[model samples]
Target: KSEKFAFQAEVNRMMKLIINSLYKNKEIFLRELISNASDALDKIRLISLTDENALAGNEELTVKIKCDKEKNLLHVTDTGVGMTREELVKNLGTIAKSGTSEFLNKMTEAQEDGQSTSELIGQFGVGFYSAFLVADKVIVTSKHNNDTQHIWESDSNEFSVIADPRGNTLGRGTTITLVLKEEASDYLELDTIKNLVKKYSQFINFPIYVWSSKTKTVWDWELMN
Candidate 1:
């Protein structure tokens, strides 16, 4: 049997708080996700200008959202710099090399003292993990710059990042599909997502679009220029 590296005790405690009580306003999850996507677009665009082939693998650089009412699914798709198989595992499985343990410890300490926790959600790029607030499961499909597409799925307790079965749906980006919990059904409503984006990430620097079935149009709401 493979032995799992024990997460620092502090990291485990903070994860529990984030999964349980960290975010009072759960809608902030969407904003942080979109902002992360926009930042990714900006990074790739900048790199493409200098490298030319920086975006060669997958040229479309857009962010899209899809809501599945029946399944209570909310998907956030992005066309930016994607991640390879190893990158997917490392990026999503473990904290980045620096400031990881320290940051987790600080967040646990703060939460124990009845402090506001929104600031800690995005500080560690663990914003991906924030989906656990509303989702029972998350499926991430990503296509890296020079690698094959891969799928990463998790239910907070454990995660598995593997090669995508559908393969390269985005060409060069990522799609995070949230299997929403019954209590988090509000996220499946288009209006709720729109309002959440405006409230928290209205100044983001990339285009954000929501796929609307009722209106038969893709809603392009410009939050940032």
Candidate 2:
């Protein structure tokens, strides 16, 4: 059964923090999301080392980014260790580490260390919330080996986790979709996304692709990394 839950107190604080604009540059959102994808891929690759059936459904380990101008949506998908429902509720619903005020202190400390703004976001484990900087809505669709596919949707303040009616769509991975704000429409441009991926994720180990329209309406995934 699908239901809704209010975000944790710390999550509420994190969203409020974003409103006060501690994150200096909005462009870091892409880098933060890509870094999160890289982390997920790293997790699955680790599991493949032990279990023969680790990659049974989908063998390719990669990240893909796509955008739709008409829909004003941006998607970042990874063929990696997706989360179960419980994992989603735990990892996403709460910071799962330090409390919000403690996290603020950590951020202040990191800044004192002279870390770059981009580095500061991912370092504090609140990188995922950065999606809210340019998006009004965030939807995460993930499939895991141990459980059925599920959807986690949020508008920053509240969230809902429900079984995905579209069964086994991902095989075994996760896809995060951002309903971009009107001001963030530029992110739907393939060139903008390509440059961001090239600049931020060039050194990542796995291949990354962006859906580009080579022939006006003929859209296809073009390798970026």
Candidate 3:
């Protein structure tokens, strides 16, 4: 079963600001999201140092990306520390008062020139919502050591969460699926996605792989088979 909730007043205001101003470049959304996935991986790795049980089931700390052109979807998955239900709400549902000032400044700059802003200071924590710029709908499936697998889905404003009917497809960590907007199809390109990851997230501590296809030469004997 799933429960739906309206965005808090502040969140609604923030969404309007993001959609109208901050997200002038749809590509930046991918950078922000990958940064977030890196942070999640760091958190769980830190905990594992003290608690052996921290990496119970899904111990691999890697990020994988895939694009489905036919479906117009993009997926980013990480085997990192997944969010519990409470953490999901707190992290995704509202922006802190301290973040408001920085958010306003960025939006103002973006609105003025229609130019893309530099990398956002991650500490303030509004990066996740950037996904809405390229995606009409975002669906997140996460599993934490302390909680059951759950799904969080959102449009630009309201969101809903529910127990995953398919159970834990990912034994741990999170997978974010973006139902890409028509204009954001470039994000589905393999080269574009790989380039963006290298440009913005090259220093990310975890291994990141993007799905790609290649042609390989075959020997005469192999070709005969």
Candidate 4:
């Protein structure tokens, strides 16, 4: 059986350009991934309206961001339809399964105006790889209904996928850990992250939560969930 999805050599070139050139604001990386997560949850929920077990893998359907200040690590976890080991590699390690040429063209145009195509590209499935620009390494720990937990690691040069050593930290979802660069430590701040979420992903369907130390009595805000 063929495991690969066919893409022309130009597809590879176009993806490299999109990843390297289009994402100017590194912080948009989080917003893009979280938006993708919200989309995934929406998909499963829509499916669940008829088949309630559609979310059999993960029922929570929320996005969580955790920052480890000591390790300079930031993690985004989503309770959505998690990918299996094969799906992880096929979806993440490779690119250009979507409209490669068109995406590249828009990105090229956006660059000329000093505008970002991050949100537009999120729907194209390449947003997952943009973590490479800000983090030294990305660790994706995921669990699916048909498969056991798996860990996929990549540093942009290449990738390796294997069964997770620590099993099921997430009941059913994907957790992405970004090993922050020294210069990218601003992402570790609570306010910076909150502001970015409000700016880009405030209207996202699912709840977005950041870990907090200070307790607060809850009140609804138009832009926050």
On TM-score, the leading prediction is 2
- lDDT of candidate 3 at residue 206, scale 0 to 100: 76
Clash number for candidate 2? 0
Query: What TM-score would each prediction reach against the true structure?
Result: 0.84, 0.90, 0.84, 0.80
C-alpha lDDT values of all predictions: 0.73, 0.83, 0.77, 0.72
By TM-score: ranked, best first: 2, 3, 1, 4
Show model 4 residue runs off by greater than 4 Å: 1-15, 96-119, 215-223
> Which predicted model would earn the best lDDT?
2
Candidate with more favorable, higher lDDT: 1 or 4: 1
Candidate 1 residue lDDT tens string, 1-225: 122333344445656766665456666678667877876788788888888788767666778777789878999888878778877766666665477666677777777798866777676656666777888998888887778888888776666766776766677888889999989998998777766756765576666777654455655433322
State how far residue 186 of model 4 sits from its true place (Å): 1.2
Q: lDDT tens string, model 3, 24-68?
A: 566777777888888889989999999898887786888888888
Off by over 4 Å in 1: 1-12, 21-23, 112-115, 213-225
Compared with the true structure, what per-residue lDDT tens digits does model 4 show for residues 140-223?
888876688988876665667778777777777888999988888988886787777767666887888777564455423223
Model 1 / residue 186 / CA error / Å: 1.6
In model 1, the worst 10-residue window by lDDT is 1-10
TM-score of predicted structure 2: 0.90
- In terms of lDDT, the poorest run of 10 residues in model 3 is 216-225
Clashing pairs in 4: none
- Screening candidate 2 with a backbone cut-off below 3 angstroms (N, C-alpha, C), the clashing residue pairs are none
